[PDB]
């Protein structure tokens, strides 16, 4: 999996080849390669790690688990519109916004977008 | 029917005790209210239940594993007059947004049926001392129709009146969210009173009133009571029911066009608040010059 | 009964649980409404299991190995890890192939790597590439490898998918790295989910640039049909009566070539909608190829599923389908004089994983038998859109069932026939009440068509009317 | 053996005023300083320039070409005692994250090399209202090896020390962060001395000084100079050496221990800055019962 | 920095006027543009004149000016030249200068709360430009109902 | 054997109604046709379907999750004579490309399969103010292979037409995009079907009819009915009536001649629309020369 | 070189395998590949072919010629910042908004957006 970082207060795109379905859950990643996405708890119940997640292979989207606890904090946070929320739970399709704490890695390509700020603002 | 209002204002200045003033002489007249205080400290609701540190949906939800578990019987307590009274909390410091208990709150509500049953208002209590996008939420979203921001003579808090209303036309296009008029809280300045007007015609709304400091407001709180139950009689509770009847049949919502820095310090130069300095001794030692 | 005693009923069930554990189970239950279409707004489903509640759901592994990749033939099965995940799905499954196993076919053989603890801390990327050369060794009439993820697999971060990457590039063999970790999905659904992924990334597409297959404008595919007991087969024929000309089943009786010839057919059968609409989106997206859903259970669906397909293809088709409804009308009609007698006004209650406990309603139907009530493990609320409109008004809706809440729903509504697997078959054997297998057809069929209404007839007949179920109380109590 | 400290306080108490009181105070005393002024307003920074408004790194960034482009001469100013003062500035109050400019400011800085040069301090003034985002960004990060807490007498300065306590806290394990003081701000208080020390005994620190009130301070100001350069021969400027002299030579770095509200009630109730309620008074009004 | 629509009594000058207005407020956060006020092309319509004005409140703004329909402006026209410049002591002349005045002296610059299209139907249909319509006969053939 | 066709032409001139009143004369012609209203503004499809406001394409993917998970049935709705009608919208007019909606609209339709049915006419309705973007897309893609426009007295409808035939003859050598003809619209000018006919011998293609106005019209409209439906004994219900024979029987597909603004010109001045300017005339005014 | 070519009018991402520096300027591509991003003219004075190009690689992007023909298309439609027309004049580096008709491909990952629609609005 290659996994295209961006951001502004990263001076470039930083591209990534990662190993799909590690513990490490994209997190792991960033801090492995130097990306700093901001990480401010221990079991997922903030919004700290919110990042914007584009399949650019589209094509080869794959599908998964949506857990009840990604969902309660992205609705937390406001970033999971009830379609999105219904495409999950019905198609298993991920959402546009994800946690990078609870985020495992696919076999595809990821284009992960981060503010550099707290998941609510 | 309802009208979903809120009430941003800087903090320290007496918000609180004002908006749950107001509530309660809305109450008074019949009207069905309800409180959703968005502080981060739970003091949005102590003078309307009555009680000390009313329980927030965030240690509830914390407490009870997730929001989805929850009941509303936990979270929404009944007050004086039938104003049904929330307080969304807040998270830790260090923890991520800290406006992530305003958005868990509204959505809590709106899932639960809380705001369809038969309520006329809904008053936000938001905390405007840092105008960010977590406590925007009422703002960015259309949640919040009408807002009226708390101010006085400081010039903090108009400042943080003026953050507020350059938020609310950033979202203007959006949804239908109007200033409903500033309202303001007495420190016994002189030209307090006579400041705020030259901001509401600047920024095109009204004061909708001028609160007058009382000691019997300062004397209800320690009662844990508001001053329109404590002393129905008092002058000051007939000044709340009329901001409250202004409040009722408020139909001025225009867009907050928002004065500069510069202006903001012309005003408040004038009006002897802070005096005017001009080329005066800078960088030079007082004794040498 | 009414939805009034069925309610009552649910919450005296409900009464029993924690709180939490009965605040979440109480969406999942619902009395049936025909006129609603929207399911959300009554029955919840997809979601996570209660923990200690002793579900009757899988896992991923289950969904992928036991359920998609499995009933492929000429690909050898990889289990990645353990010895245990790849030991009890071993032919436990009853679909049906034609191979010499061993040599061609390998359905019915376990092929793992039996991970040791020298693996879980030192990884299994070298084990692997081992593996595959031995296999390539000792099985050299194979067509593909499949390499099926059990739970260590992710938590220790193996990389397969490099290690199928070049492999594949050495010996020129499809290799297909299968994520089918058990944790990674609350039931065999995303398992479907995952294997149907494999499938359209590493085999479906190795034939988009060849041309030399010939094409006939009456080439079909049968999808999400993998011929337990034979099912596949029985409607195959009922499809080339027809004039059609099935190119691939997947993946009951199925090879890598008949996947890779799909993308060159008219039109796509699907016969379980839950395992296989994943692919059939992605063949109608890419390829073009339109799909439709028929059910084969009991001769009114199957004439149907007949009728619309014909109607799909021009008049010599149609009336080919005539012809074919004619032929087998008597057959049935037969079948249906002998035994509707018998099971007339009997009532049934089923729990089966995600398409059956809605398709074979229709065949109880022509038995004169009526469902009071069905349920899924792990279908989703496409699945209920289209069950709400299948079952009668107050009839009793689930959704992942326990086994308390089944046990007390059982006792209470007091079913003359239960359908269900294998885990709950001796629970209702031991309390008088007929159990039919609905996964494995208890060891019999096939179900589908109009050659297996009979069995199905047959098979109901046998096990409500047994003698054995008035036995049960001692004559001396 | 550069020292980087923080300079965290709620608004309003005159945290800028004493920021630079103590940077000058450190520029005479034979030390190489630098000022990032993390509060999104650009109050910070101001007296040293003796230029209103210093353009900030926002500004700037926004002006042209975002930071790639951003020149580190036009984003730090020389001003009074030799230092080096740069405005970090804030976005559009309704949209983004208030502390966004303190990140963007710290990592521009780091790249262009602002701390490579040899300096002895480096001194962050951020805000303390909420501890959150970009605020809590030097304390989530290594970037504020200390921490003073500008403190006053009223509820909400001890509420916001509090918070940034929890904060120090939180990230106690990960970096080298601690908090090595409390500075308090006179409000007039009698007992407002008292009370911050023992707040800082129950947060388990130290006083760093206490800073009295004084007209100099409002005559400086007003000249838009520092008391040090307006009149080092008066008391407040030995007064703010003093304290200069102390944060120089302090060693008590210690990981705090935040208190409960109930605890932080109990030093209000104590020192007379709040009133004892009696529980018979709450929920009866007067002239009933 | 200023903007001044041209409306008439016709709707689709308002409906105009509306969008450009509802485009205003949508980059007034970005930069400082506001709407100065409408102005007016009479079409000799009865109830032009006020229509706008129920507009310009309506939107929080001042029609600072109404035109009058003159055979003046269109002789001049045909002579490629301004109605100003042809004749100077024409009472055109005298309303133009007005118009110019009050644009010099506008200090009146607001953000243009936009209309809704249901209210901007109900002004048109109670000033007579279009008829009110009511369970009138709808779907069905005219001698038939 | 499906026609495309679309008919462009500038608002103002009634386009919708004489649109609909010929979708409604092919119907009740044994003809199953489908109108696709490419208006930003709802206008067109309200005659037939007797309903105000139909919700647009652009609403209901705003509405909910884009375009992906919008069912076909939510988006047309059958009307008057079995036709099938769907209105696509526009987005915000501050933002984007005005005809953003058409293409959307034809992407989706396109991709549902609402074409791949039986049906004989699909007609699109664009406006001819603009020839660009989402306008243009019809032309520029092969989704209209018949083009009709409808024109009027006024020279802005000319000059529409113009533009619209430039935009048929770029793309002339790559689809198969033809200007059938055009249909004018009485604006009550002693002299309009002339100039009709003129300007179509000019541009080498045919005047198809011309439509007089009637009363009838507005008394349809305003009952939110079609002339056919509300009258089909009025005479211009088989005036719409001779129109759609003489289209669906029309063959005449050709490349136009788009003239210049000068021979535009020409023909106002020729046919009295406007007068005639002597050059003696200009630069000098009355009453001083 | 990868060009993933992403739009609302697609149903997904595109992934699409390409030549560097071929006389084809990324419409052949696109038209090879079937991504349809509206050209309407031959000779490069419109700005309907307008795309944003992000490159993913960061640390891999090339040097190219912003021509003047481009650079002024590009103005007029408003998509060149002065900051950015500075940049490409004095350190060679490509703006964000390009013309896909004029821009030649690159031996790096690149992702093009287009909104349907020609480059003024
Ligand atoms: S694949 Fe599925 S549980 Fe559709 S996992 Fe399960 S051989 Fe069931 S109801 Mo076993 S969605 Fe097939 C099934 Fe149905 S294994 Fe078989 S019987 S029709
Ligand atoms: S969810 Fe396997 S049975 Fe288990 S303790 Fe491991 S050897 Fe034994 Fe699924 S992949 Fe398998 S079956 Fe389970 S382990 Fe996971
Ligand atoms: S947006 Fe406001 S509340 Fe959220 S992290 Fe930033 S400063 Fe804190
Ligand atoms: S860091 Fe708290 S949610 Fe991931
Ligand atoms: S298509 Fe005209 S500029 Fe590229």
């Not at chain 1, 079991?43 to 009840?68: A, F, Y």
């Not at chain 2, 209002?5 to 107001?22: E, F, P, V």
């Not at chain 2, 307090?192 to 004061?207: R, S, V, W």
Request: aromatic residues 8%.
């Amino acid at each position: 999996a290659t996994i295209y970082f961006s951001s502004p207060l990263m001076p470039h795109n930083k591209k990534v080849q990662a190993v799909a379905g590690k513990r490490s859950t994209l997190l792991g990643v960033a801090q492995e390669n130097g990306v700093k996405i901001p990480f401010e708890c221990q079991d997922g119940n903030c919004g700290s790690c919110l990042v914007k997640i584009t399949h650019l292979d589209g094509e080869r989207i794959k599908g998964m688990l949506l857990t009840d606890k990604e969902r309660n904090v992205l609705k937390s946070v406001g970033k999971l519109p009830k379609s999105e929320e219904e495409r999950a739970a019905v198609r298993d399709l991920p959402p546009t916004y994800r946690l990078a704490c609870q985020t495992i890695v696919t076999d595809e390509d990821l284009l992960v977008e981060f503010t550099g700020e707290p998941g609510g603002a | 029917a309802m009208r979903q209002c809120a009430i941003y204002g800087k903090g320290g200045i007496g918000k609180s005790t004002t908006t749950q003033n107001l509530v309660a002489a809305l109450a008074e007249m019949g009207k069905k209210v309800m409180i959703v205080g968005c502080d981060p400290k739970a003091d949005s609701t102590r003078l309307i239940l009555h009680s000390k540190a009313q329980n927030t949906i965030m240690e509830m939800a914390a407490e009870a594993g997730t929001v989805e578990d929850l009941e509303l019987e936990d979270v929404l307590k009944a007050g004086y007059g039938g104003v049904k009274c929330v307080e969304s909390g807040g998270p830790e410091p260090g923890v991520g947004c800290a406006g992530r208990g305003v958005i868990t709150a509204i959505n809590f509500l709106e899932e639960e049926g809380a705001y369809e049953d038969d309520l006329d208002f809904v008053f936000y209590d938001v905390l405007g001392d840092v105008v960010c996008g977590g406590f925007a939420m009422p703002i960015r979203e259309n949640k919040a129709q009408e807002i009226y921001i708390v101010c006085s003579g400081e010039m903090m808090a108009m400042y943080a009146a003026n953050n507020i209303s350059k938020g609310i036309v950033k979202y203007a296009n959006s949804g239908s969210v109007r200033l409903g008029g500033l309202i303001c809280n007495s420190r016994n300045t002189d030209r307090e009173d006579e400041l705020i007007i030259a901001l509401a015609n600047k920024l095109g709304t009204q004061m909708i009133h001028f609160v007058p400091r009382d000691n019997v407001v300062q004397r209800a709180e320690i009662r844990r009571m508001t001053v329109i139950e404590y002393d129905p009689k008092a002058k000051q509770a007939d000044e709340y029911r009329a901001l409250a009847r202004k409040v009722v049949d408020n139909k001025l919502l225009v867009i907050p066009n928002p004065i500069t820095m510069d202006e903001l310090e012309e005003l408040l130069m004038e009006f002897g608040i802070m005096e005017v300095e001009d080329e005066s001794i800078v960088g030079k030692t007082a004794e040498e010059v | 009964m009414s939805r009034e005693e069925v309610e009552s009923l649910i919450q005296e069930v409900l009464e029993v649980y924690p709180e939490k554990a009965r605040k979440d189970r109480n969406k999942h239950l619902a009395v049936n409404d025909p006129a609603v279409t929207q399911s959300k707004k009554c029955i919840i489903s997809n979601k996570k299991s209660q923990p200690g509640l002793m579900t009757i759901r899988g896992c991923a592994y289950a969904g992928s190995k036991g359920v998609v990749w499995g009933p492929i033939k000429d690909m050898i099965h990889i289990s990645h890890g353990p010895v245990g995940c790849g030991q009890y799905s071993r032919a436990g499954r009853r679909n049906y192939y034609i191979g010499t196993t061993g040599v061609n076919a390998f359905v019915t053989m376990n092929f793992t790597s039996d991970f040791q603890e020298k693996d879980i801390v030192f990884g299994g990327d070298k084990k692997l590439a081992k593996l595959i050369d031995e296999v390539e060794t000792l099985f050299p009439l194979n067509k593909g490898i499949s390499v099926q993820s059990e739970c260590p697999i992710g938590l220790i971060g193996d990389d397969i998918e490099s290690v199928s990457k070049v492999k594949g590039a050495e010996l020129s063999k499809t290799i297909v790295p299968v994520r089918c970790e058990g944790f990674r999905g609350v039931s065999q659904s995303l398992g479907h989910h995952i294997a149907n992924d494999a499938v359209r990334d590493w085999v479906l597409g190795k034939r988009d640039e060849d041309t030399t297959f010939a094409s006939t404008p009456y080439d079909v595919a049968i999808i999400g049909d993998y011929n337990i007991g034979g099912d596949a087969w029985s409607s195959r024929i009922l499809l080339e009566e027809m004039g059609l000309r099935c190119v691939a089943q997947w993946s009951g009786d199925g090879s890598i070539s008949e996947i890779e010839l799909t993308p060159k057919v008219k039109l796509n059968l699907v016969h379980c909608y839950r395992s296989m609409n994943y692919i059939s989106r992605h063949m109608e997206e890419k390829y073009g190829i339109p799909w439709m859903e028929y059910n084969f259970f009991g001769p009114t669906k199957t004439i149907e599923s007949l009728r619309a397909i014909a109607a799909k293809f021009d008049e010599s088709i149609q009336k080919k389908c005539e012809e074919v409804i004619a032929k087998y009308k008597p057959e049935w009609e037969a079948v249906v004089a002998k035994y509707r007698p018998r099971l007339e006004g009997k009532r049934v209650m089923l729990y089966i994983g995600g398409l059956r406990p809605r398709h074979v309603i229709g065949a109880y139907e022509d038995l004169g038998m009526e469902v009071v009530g069905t349920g899924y493990e792990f279908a989703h609320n496409d699945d209920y859109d289209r069950t709400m409109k299948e079952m009668g008004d107050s009839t009793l809706l689930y959704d992942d069932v326990t086994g308390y809440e089944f046990e007390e729903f059982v006792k209470r509504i007091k079913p003359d026939l239960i359908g269900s697997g294998i885990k709950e078959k001796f629970i209702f054997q031991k309390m008088g009440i007929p159990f039919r297998e609905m996964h494995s057809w208890d060891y019999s069929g096939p179900y589908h068509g109009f050659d297996g209404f009979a069995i199905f007839a047959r098979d109901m007949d046998m096990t409500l009317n047994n003698p054995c179920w008035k036995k049960l109380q001692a004559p001396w109590e």
